[PDB]
Write a protein that binds this ligand. Structure first.
Ligand SMILES: CCCCCCCCOCCOCCOCCOCCO
Ligand SMILES: CCCCCCCCOCCOCCOCCOCCO
Ligand SMILES: [Ca+2]
Ligand SMILES: [Ca+2]
Ligand SMILES: [Fe+2]
Length: 675
């Protein structure tokens, strides 16, 4: 008839509560009356953990549900008070001479109401058929689906959350007040610096290449100074296709596209007389970076001046024996001919540099619209929203995935509110603008596939499993492995058979919703619409976790490093590509690069998005203990120590590198997409 009730309250700002709190214990034999927890004093302040003794009049049998009621204090003749939001971490029941029942919560009880919690043992739908529990899950998902709905944002995009402003979001999916203030103080300080130098207000060109170094009095990193030092070197231009901002396009080439008419003469130069184009295509030493998806893209206006975008192709040569990757030829158009010369490293200094810079402009547009926004933000939001809608709090797959959604709905809502709207940085300072970004996302959504999101298949598909110096691959594959091993352990704990995967109705609705709302029911994407085997579930969940953590970390962390020296990543171009050779100059080169205000507005935004503001939850670190069972908790431990070992490999590796690759070091990977 006695229970001890132990309650943990959150540490965040505002976590604690004035309000009175009572719990009803529901069991197989019946439900108890509400039981007070107010005890003596302000028991529910931030960071508190405190015990209460409740006596149950009637026995309840096996405990099934904990109902938590919250209500503001009540004054005689004056009514209640304003509700005081409470962040509850978890409850622990301890019956007479029995073990502990632990009820993970980790949510906000804003205002007055009641919250129903199952014990912490993860339960697939078929795992406990008690009707009281089936009702609770069913009611929870109905409530979630009303809370968190879909809207169509643009034609041909993935659908997104049906909310207009960050103000309208539930506490449970909002930035913490600490992370939010850290964010606005950074952005505020940075905008102030950049504005008071008049650089956000200079229309017109940079005065010289020297003047563009002024960006280093704004912000400095060693990676970014390296780009100033080495930007003109062919080996650094090429190395950034493997370890820079956008390391996902390079692919081995046995057959040159017919629209890229490279000749033997054009490459005898770099290749030596001991070989031939056809001989190197066959040897597997030639690689292609194809920016064709940009062809004919709508372009923007900046300070009333039309801007330009190319859609180029770059041939690259892997020299033997850990030698450098080297560019061989660049065509800046998808349609060859006399007005789209094929530029070579042997051309005049500024012809070749101008050609390389247009490719670097193309990486800017490709990376930010597709690799960053669509693949690392929109797809994680779909995964997140589907999870909220289809997987209930007690489901092992919710327990597993929820840390990897943190703040994702918040940050995408913010982008839709303040980033991709008129007057903001996209519209005022990029070459392709809002419309070009949407065009790119619409095109990509029509040829996107599962293999690009699964890193081992992506590496295999692109024929880049052996190319040396590819640290995005080296480190990403180790991480992929660690996540895959973690997910496979967790699946094996709770799903005994392929039949049990199919029989999971909630799991099947979750995949289906992702396929429909996120991938627009396109069977050409190859993304599963159902999951029939344990093996396929493991692969699919690994893809979600990897995409939400390491994938976004890999393509977000080098943004500022890559763009601080603007010729290394011009966000726009102001003259069309050259239509013949022998015309490029330094003066002409700076005249093609973007105006000062657009340069700085973009760097300011890339600096703020490169860095996690506020506090970090690095990959594998799970302070909200949704898993309360020994087995998953061992699996977490194994995942954490494997990441730490990968991190030691990365520092040892990086020790003897002039340009270390840090974007996939696990401590610096966030669990979710949050910036
Ligand atoms: C971290 C402060 C956040 C303040 C937000 C808006 C600030 C308005 O302008 C002041 C920020 O400018 C900082 C630039 O540094 C000049 C101040 O002194 C720097 C040497 O300590
Ligand atoms: C002064 C502009 C600072 C930016 C503040 C708003 C950031 C909120 O959105 C971030 C989430 O969006 C991520 C998508 O990738 C961003 C692509 O934009 C880069 C073009 O500059
Ligand atoms: Ca409060
Ligand atoms: Ca109290
Ligand atoms: Fe991001």
């Amino acid at each position: 008839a006695e229970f001890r009730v132990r309650v943990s309250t959150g540490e965040a700002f505002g976590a604690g509560t004035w309000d009175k709190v009572s719990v009803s214990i529901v069991g197989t034999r019946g439900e108890s009356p509400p039981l007070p927890l107010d005890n003596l004093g302000k028991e529910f302040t931030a960071g508190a953990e405190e015990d209460f003794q409740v006596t149950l009049p009637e026995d309840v049998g096996r405990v099934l549900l904990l109902r938590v009621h919250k209500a503001p204090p009540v004054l005689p003749l004056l009514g209640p008070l304003a509700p005081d939001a409470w962040f509850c971490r978890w409850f622990q029941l301890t019956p007479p001479r029995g073990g502990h029942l632990l009820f993970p919560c980790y949510q906000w009880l804003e205002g007055a109401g009641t919250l129903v919690l199952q014990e912490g043992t993860a339960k697939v739908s078929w795992a406990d058929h008690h009707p009281v529990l089936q009702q609770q899950r069913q009611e929870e998902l109905q409530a979630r689906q009303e809370m968190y709905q879909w809207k169509a944002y643009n034609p041909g995009w993935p659908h997104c959350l049906d909310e207009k402003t960050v103000e309208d979001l539930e506490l449970n999916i909002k930035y913490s007040t600490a992370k939010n203030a850290n964010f606005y103080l950074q952005a505020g300080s940075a905008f102030a610096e950049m504005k008071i130098k008049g650089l956000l207000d200079r229309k017109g060109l940079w005065r010289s290449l020297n003047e563009m170094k002024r960006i280093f009095n704004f912000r400095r990193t060693p990676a970014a100074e390296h780009a100033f030092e080495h930007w003109q070197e062919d080996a650094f231009f090429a190395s950034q296709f493997l370890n820079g901002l956008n390391p996902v396009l390079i692919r081995r080439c046995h057959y040159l596209p017919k629209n890229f008419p490279v000749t033997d003469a054009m490459v005898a130069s770099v290749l030596g007389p001991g070989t031939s184009l056809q001989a190197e295509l066959e040897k597997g030493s030639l690689f292609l970076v194809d920016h064709g998806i940009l062809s004919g893209i709508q372009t923007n206006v900046i300070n009333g001046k039309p801007q330009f975008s190319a859609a180029p192709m770059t041939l690259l040569y892997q020299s033997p024996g850990c030698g450098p990757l080297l560019p061989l030829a660049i065509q800046l158009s998808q349609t060859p001919g006399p007005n789209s010369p094929i530029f070579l490293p042997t051309d005049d200094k500024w012809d070749w540099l101008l050609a390389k810079t247009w490719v670097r402009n193309a990486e800017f547009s490709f990376h930010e619209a597709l690799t960053h926004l669509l693949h690392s933000h929109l797809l994680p939001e779909v995964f997140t929203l589907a999870t909220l809608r289809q997987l209930p709090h007690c489901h092992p797959l919710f327990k597993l995935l929820i840390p990897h959604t943190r703040y994702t709905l918040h940050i995408n809502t913010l982008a839709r509110e303040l980033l991709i709207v008129p007057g903001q940085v996209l519209d005022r300072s990029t070459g392709i603008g809002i419309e070009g970004f949407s065009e790119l996302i619409q095109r990509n959504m029509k040829q996107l596939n599962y293999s690009l999101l699964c890193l081992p298949e992506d590496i295999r598909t692109r024929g880049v499993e052996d190319i040396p110096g590819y640290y995005y691959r080296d480190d990403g594959m180790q991480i992929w492995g660690a996540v895959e091993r973690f997910v496979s352990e967790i699946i094996g704990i709770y799903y005994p058979s392929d039949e049990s995967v199919q029989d999971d109705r909630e799991l099947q609705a979750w995949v289906r919703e992702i396929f429909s709302k996120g991938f627009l029911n396109q069977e050409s994407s190859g993304i599963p619409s159902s999951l029939e085997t344990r093996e396929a579930l493991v692969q699919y969940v690994t893809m979600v976790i990897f995409t939400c953590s390491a994938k976004h970390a890999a393509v977000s962390a080098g943004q500022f490093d890559s763009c601080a020296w603007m010729p290394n990543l011009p966000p726009s171009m102001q003259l069309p590509p050259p239509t013949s050779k022998g015309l490029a100059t330094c003066e002409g080169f700076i005249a093609t690069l973007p105006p000062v205000n657009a340069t700085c507005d973009v760097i300011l935004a890339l600096w703020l998005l490169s860095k996690e503001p506020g506090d970090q939850r690095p990959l594998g670190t799970y302070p909200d203990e949704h898993f309360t069972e020994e087995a998953p908790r061992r699996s977490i431990a194994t995942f954490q120590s494997r990441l730490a070992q990968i991190s030691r490999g990365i520092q040892e590796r990086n020790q003897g590198l002039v340009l270390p690759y840090t974007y996939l070091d696990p401590p610096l990977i966030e669990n979710s997409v949050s910036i």
